[PDB]
Scaffold this motif. Sequence first.
Motif, PDB file in Angstrom:
ATOM      1  N   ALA B  99       0.824  -1.209   0.000  1.00  0.00           N
ATOM      2  CA  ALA B  99       0.000   0.000   0.000  1.00  0.00           C
ATOM      3  C   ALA B  99       0.861   1.263   0.000  1.00  0.00           C
ATOM      4  CB  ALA B  99      -0.979   0.010   1.177  1.00  0.00           C
ATOM      5  N   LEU B 100       1.817   1.324  -0.921  1.00  0.00           N
ATOM      6  CA  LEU B 100       2.672   2.496  -1.029  1.00  0.00           C
ATOM      7  C   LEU B 100       1.853   3.696  -1.500  1.00  0.00           C
ATOM      8  CD1 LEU B 100       5.776   3.051  -0.677  1.00  0.00           C
ATOM      9  CD2 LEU B 100       5.923   2.927  -3.174  1.00  0.00           C
ATOM     10  N   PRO B 101       2.070   4.878  -0.922  1.00  0.00           N
ATOM     11  CA  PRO B 101       1.315   6.060  -1.357  1.00  0.00           C
ATOM     12  C   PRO B 101       1.559   6.372  -2.826  1.00  0.00           C
ATOM     13  CG  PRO B 101       2.410   6.470   0.736  1.00  0.00           C
ATOM     14  CD  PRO B 101       2.940   5.166   0.229  1.00  0.00           C
ATOM     15  N   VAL B 102       0.513   6.853  -3.491  1.00  0.00           N
ATOM     16  CA  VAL B 102       0.530   7.121  -4.924  1.00  0.00           C
ATOM     17  C   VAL B 102       0.110   8.566  -5.152  1.00  0.00           C
ATOM     18  CG1 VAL B 102      -0.449   6.512  -7.158  1.00  0.00           C
ATOM     19  CG2 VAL B 102       0.079   4.721  -5.502  1.00  0.00           C
ATOM     20  N   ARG B 111       8.271   8.400 -11.396  1.00  0.00           N
ATOM     21  CA  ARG B 111       9.418   9.059 -10.780  1.00  0.00           C
ATOM     22  C   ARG B 111       9.208   9.212  -9.283  1.00  0.00           C
ATOM     23  NH1 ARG B 111      10.974  14.341 -14.323  1.00  0.00           N
ATOM     24  NH2 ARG B 111       8.912  13.789 -15.148  1.00  0.00           N
ATOM     25  N   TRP B 112       8.030   9.709  -8.890  1.00  0.00           N
ATOM     26  CA  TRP B 112       7.733   9.897  -7.477  1.00  0.00           C
ATOM     27  C   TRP B 112       8.014   8.630  -6.688  1.00  0.00           C
ATOM     28  CZ3 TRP B 112       7.034  12.509  -3.252  1.00  0.00           C
ATOM     29  CH2 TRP B 112       6.312  11.948  -2.193  1.00  0.00           C
ATOM     30  N   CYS B 113       7.507   7.489  -7.169  1.00  0.00           N
ATOM     31  CA  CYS B 113       7.707   6.240  -6.447  1.00  0.00           C
ATOM     32  C   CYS B 113       9.180   6.026  -6.147  1.00  0.00           C
ATOM     33  CB  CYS B 113       7.145   5.067  -7.251  1.00  0.00           C
ATOM     34  SG  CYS B 113       7.498   3.444  -6.537  1.00  0.00           S
ATOM     35  N   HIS B 114      10.030   6.138  -7.174  1.00  0.00           N
ATOM     36  CA  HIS B 114      11.459   5.939  -6.967  1.00  0.00           C
ATOM     37  C   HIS B 114      11.960   6.833  -5.846  1.00  0.00           C
ATOM     38  CE1 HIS B 114      11.668   3.145 -10.111  1.00  0.00           C
ATOM     39  NE2 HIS B 114      11.878   3.955 -11.133  1.00  0.00           N
ATOM     40  N   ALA B 115      11.664   8.133  -5.939  1.00  0.00           N
ATOM     41  CA  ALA B 115      12.123   9.068  -4.921  1.00  0.00           C
ATOM     42  C   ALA B 115      11.706   8.595  -3.539  1.00  0.00           C
ATOM     43  CB  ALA B 115      11.576  10.465  -5.205  1.00  0.00           C
ATOM     44  N   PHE B 116      10.426   8.238  -3.386  1.00  0.00           N
ATOM     45  CA  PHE B 116       9.945   7.844  -2.071  1.00  0.00           C
ATOM     46  C   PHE B 116      10.734   6.655  -1.552  1.00  0.00           C
ATOM     47  CE2 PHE B 116       6.356   8.678   0.802  1.00  0.00           C
ATOM     48  CZ  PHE B 116       6.524   7.641   1.695  1.00  0.00           C
ATOM     49  N   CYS B 117      10.960   5.656  -2.412  1.00  0.00           N
ATOM     50  CA  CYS B 117      11.700   4.479  -1.980  1.00  0.00           C
ATOM     51  C   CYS B 117      13.006   4.889  -1.320  1.00  0.00           C
ATOM     52  CB  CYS B 117      11.957   3.556  -3.171  1.00  0.00           C
ATOM     53  SG  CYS B 117      12.701   1.970  -2.750  1.00  0.00           S
ATOM     54  N   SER B 140      19.471  -2.067   0.643  1.00  0.00           N
ATOM     55  CA  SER B 140      19.411  -1.670  -0.755  1.00  0.00           C
ATOM     56  C   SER B 140      18.162  -2.242  -1.411  1.00  0.00           C
ATOM     57  CB  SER B 140      20.655  -2.132  -1.525  1.00  0.00           C
ATOM     58  OG  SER B 140      20.512  -1.895  -2.914  1.00  0.00           O
ATOM     59  N   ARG B 141      17.583  -1.460  -2.317  1.00  0.00           N
ATOM     60  CA  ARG B 141      16.450  -1.919  -3.106  1.00  0.00           C
ATOM     61  C   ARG B 141      16.884  -3.033  -4.056  1.00  0.00           C
ATOM     62  NH1 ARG B 141      13.586   2.183  -7.288  1.00  0.00           N
ATOM     63  NH2 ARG B 141      13.265   0.660  -8.967  1.00  0.00           N
ATOM     64  N   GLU B 142      16.004  -4.019  -4.227  1.00  0.00           N
ATOM     65  CA  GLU B 142      16.327  -5.168  -5.066  1.00  0.00           C
ATOM     66  C   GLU B 142      15.321  -5.360  -6.195  1.00  0.00           C
ATOM     67  OE1 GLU B 142      19.657  -5.251  -3.846  1.00  0.00           O
ATOM     68  OE2 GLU B 142      19.129  -6.680  -5.428  1.00  0.00           O
ATOM     69  N   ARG B 143      14.036  -5.159  -5.912  1.00  0.00           N
ATOM     70  CA  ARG B 143      13.009  -5.398  -6.917  1.00  0.00           C
ATOM     71  C   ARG B 143      11.778  -4.571  -6.576  1.00  0.00           C
ATOM     72  NH1 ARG B 143       9.284  -9.261  -8.877  1.00  0.00           N
ATOM     73  NH2 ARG B 143       9.686 -11.092  -7.565  1.00  0.00           N
ATOM     74  N   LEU B 144      11.008  -4.241  -7.612  1.00  0.00           N
ATOM     75  CA  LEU B 144       9.764  -3.485  -7.482  1.00  0.00           C
ATOM     76  C   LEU B 144       8.664  -4.281  -8.179  1.00  0.00           C
ATOM     77  CD1 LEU B 144       8.511  -0.670  -6.551  1.00  0.00           C
ATOM     78  CD2 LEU B 144       8.789  -0.015  -8.952  1.00  0.00           C
ATOM     79  N   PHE B 145       7.740  -4.838  -7.390  1.00  0.00           N
ATOM     80  CA  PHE B 145       6.663  -5.646  -7.957  1.00  0.00           C
ATOM     81  C   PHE B 145       5.769  -4.813  -8.867  1.00  0.00           C
ATOM     82  CE2 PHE B 145       7.764  -7.920  -4.028  1.00  0.00           C
ATOM     83  CZ  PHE B 145       7.969  -9.188  -4.534  1.00  0.00           C
ATOM     84  N   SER B 146       5.282  -3.683  -8.368  1.00  0.00           N
ATOM     85  CA  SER B 146       4.385  -2.821  -9.125  1.00  0.00           C
ATOM     86  C   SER B 146       4.485  -1.413  -8.552  1.00  0.00           C
ATOM     87  CB  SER B 146       2.947  -3.345  -9.087  1.00  0.00           C
ATOM     88  OG  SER B 146       2.070  -2.479  -9.787  1.00  0.00           O
ATOM     89  N   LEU B 147       3.536  -0.562  -8.941  1.00  0.00           N
ATOM     90  CA  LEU B 147       3.554   0.828  -8.509  1.00  0.00           C
ATOM     91  C   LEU B 147       3.223   0.999  -7.032  1.00  0.00           C
ATOM     92  CD1 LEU B 147       1.815   2.492 -11.594  1.00  0.00           C
ATOM     93  CD2 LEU B 147       4.255   2.498 -11.017  1.00  0.00           C
ATOM     94  N   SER B 148       2.736  -0.046  -6.358  1.00  0.00           N
ATOM     95  CA  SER B 148       2.343   0.057  -4.958  1.00  0.00           C
ATOM     96  C   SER B 148       2.784  -1.161  -4.151  1.00  0.00           C
ATOM     97  CB  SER B 148       0.834   0.260  -4.835  1.00  0.00           C
ATOM     98  OG  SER B 148       0.138  -0.945  -5.096  1.00  0.00           O
ATOM     99  N   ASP B 149       4.013  -1.632  -4.360  1.00  0.00           N
ATOM    100  CA  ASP B 149       4.533  -2.766  -3.602  1.00  0.00           C
ATOM    101  C   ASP B 149       6.048  -2.784  -3.733  1.00  0.00           C
ATOM    102  OD1 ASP B 149       4.875  -5.082  -2.155  1.00  0.00           O
ATOM    103  OD2 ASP B 149       3.314  -6.204  -3.213  1.00  0.00           O
TER     104      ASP B 149
END
Lengths: 156, 156, 156, 156
Positions: B99-102, B111-117, B140-149
């Motif tokens: 449930a990552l903020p969108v 782009r926003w998502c990346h910044a937030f991570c 460290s970040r490894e993988r991004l399932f989708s825009l909200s995970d």
Amino acid sequence: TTTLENPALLGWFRGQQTPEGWFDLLALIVDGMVRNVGELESQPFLRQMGIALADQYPLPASETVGELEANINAQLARFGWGCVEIDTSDTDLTLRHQALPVSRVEDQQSRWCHAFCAILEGLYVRWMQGQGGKSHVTVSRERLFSLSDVQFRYHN
Amino acid sequence: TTTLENPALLGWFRGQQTPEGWFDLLALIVDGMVRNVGELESQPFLRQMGIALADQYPLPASETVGELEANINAQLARFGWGCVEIDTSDTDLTLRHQALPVSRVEDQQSRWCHAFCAILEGLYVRWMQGQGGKSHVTVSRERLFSLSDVQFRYHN
Amino acid sequence: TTTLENPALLGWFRGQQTPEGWFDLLALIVDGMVRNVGELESQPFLRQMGIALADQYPLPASETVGELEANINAQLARFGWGCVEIDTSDTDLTLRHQALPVSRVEDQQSRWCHAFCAILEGLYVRWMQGQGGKSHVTVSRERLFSLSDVQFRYHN
Amino acid sequence: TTTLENPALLGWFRGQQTPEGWFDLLALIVDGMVRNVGELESQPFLRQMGIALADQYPLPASETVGELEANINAQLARFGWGCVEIDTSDTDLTLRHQALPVSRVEDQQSRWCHAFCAILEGLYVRWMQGQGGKSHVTVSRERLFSLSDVQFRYHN
């Protein structure tokens, strides 16, 4: 795609749906009244209360069922009570209400649910009367899927 | 059992997750800075900011991974940012954030998502050092399932 | 007859004015950026950001100064930032902004105040341009009464 | 310092104090019940309701009257109902409650106030019982300042 299989997320969502303080007092008042007076004979009076609520917040005129659904969804989201969807049958209408509010005390929950359902009845009726529906036309329950989902039947 | 197949419910949930006004200004500031400087070049600096935030709100000591998960979930629910779950491997830890903020504007959202991570990374590090973690140990970040995970890996 | 001589009431009001979490992160980002660049050098850029914000939330057409004041007051109440009042002179206008948000940390608070004022400038300009105002007009500060009270002067 | 001579600020404050939906339904329920039964003979029952509410949220142990004031203020701010202050007399205690919630309907508002006052009575009693006080001691009204300010006298 974001489900609520994790109990923490659903717990936070349910806690944010009903803010602290006022909801507990309202539940206490309703439970005390229903215990003091009774189940069946309390059905009419509560309904009347719901009608009064609809007098506070009138809706604008609507021409299609989709627009009426949009207005009802907007008002319900303003209240933060959940969501409802419309379906049309061969002769009658059906309203599916999801994410029904839940009291914190589990034992009384069932009773509370019934009480809350009654209120919705009255409210819904007046909203359907916004288009010119007759006063004697009402709605009634048909079935209860679970503790947080209900469906209503509208017929003339 | 209350899913979000109805777009109205998920829309209301996402709107209530991020209240109006402050979030838009924060997104505008972050997007402007990341455009002016760059995604990679701003990655370290943002991390530091996250660490500073963790200085504000310390957590009590924990003895088990479950207790630390409970404290992290409580703090995240206090912030209203979503939920995270802990998993343990043979050598490394994994955090699953749901449930990552969108952002409301879909164009910049990626782009926003990346910044937030990025900022989350820094925050997590300090909390992991609550149990005696060393300063040089990072995530460290490894993988991004989708825009909200999102998922994070804790390793030496 | 509702004064704020008791510290608890004003504390609760100020705490609910700025919800938890997002405001601290925004303050940290703004303070870090202004320390990195400088108070004067960051003054123009911030203004531009404010302009972008005004593009998000347009106002309806207004015919009188009172109606425009009503629209601005409604939008600020929607934001929960405080209130503003309009005064008219022989040639120029004045806007008094009350209940300015205050950061929780007292040491940095003063700096924060200045930064916030800059943003408002840009926003106000575009709103004043809502009636057809041209680009060459400017808005500048004149005096600061206290940590939570500002006034702006607009001239052609 | 920051007064509320502008009606807009006090209007926003009062509107945020009672969020939409739940408060209107609670006011309707209370007003209907009191109209159906009567003001005086409805005084006892309501009191017991308040007692039940105090059963939900116990307070931690306190050694001084100031500490008890701090606990009560914290809980009230958690509810967002306003603030109260303690004063000690030669033999009895006095509680001054400020910023009492006000209903949106001005005609019925006065009646509502009286009803609300009753509830507070019961609640306060149980909280005073937190220090080992016996059940037989109660609190009563003495006079009413205005529609948003009240004072209670606690005597043995």
